[PDB]
Amino acid sequence: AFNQTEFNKLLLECVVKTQSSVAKILGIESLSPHVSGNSKFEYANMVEDIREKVSSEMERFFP
Amino acid sequence: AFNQTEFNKLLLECVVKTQSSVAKILGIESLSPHVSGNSKFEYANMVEDIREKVSSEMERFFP
């Protein structure tokens, strides 16, 4: 009833597709008229924040 | 105890649901007036980019 390889395929396809799609959404949103002048929401600034968060979570599980 | 089958069910439901939801968000955002007339944020173009990124990540684990 269960195929682990197929499960991993779908799982990986979903999370990679979602991250890539979310990056683009973030891009469009950072250009939104109602946040301009708020630098907290400038694309580069947000990407830096995000990478920092990722690093600290990854460092926890992978040297 | 920790039921692995139930964990997998919830896991898969979340990631599939999120990818489908994010596809729709991407669609709506692509139509946003502030990014209209920008070939960078045209739906078809972004979908192509995304699929390319998925391919290269999938090919890494699944020959």
């Binding site: 890539s20 990056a23 683009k24 891009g27 469009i28 694309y43 990407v47 995000i50 | 972004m46 990124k53």
Partner: peptide, 7 residues
């Protein structure tokens, strides 16, 4: 990195 780039 620019809006719409993968990161």
């Amino acid at each position: 990195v620019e809006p719409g780039d993968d990161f």
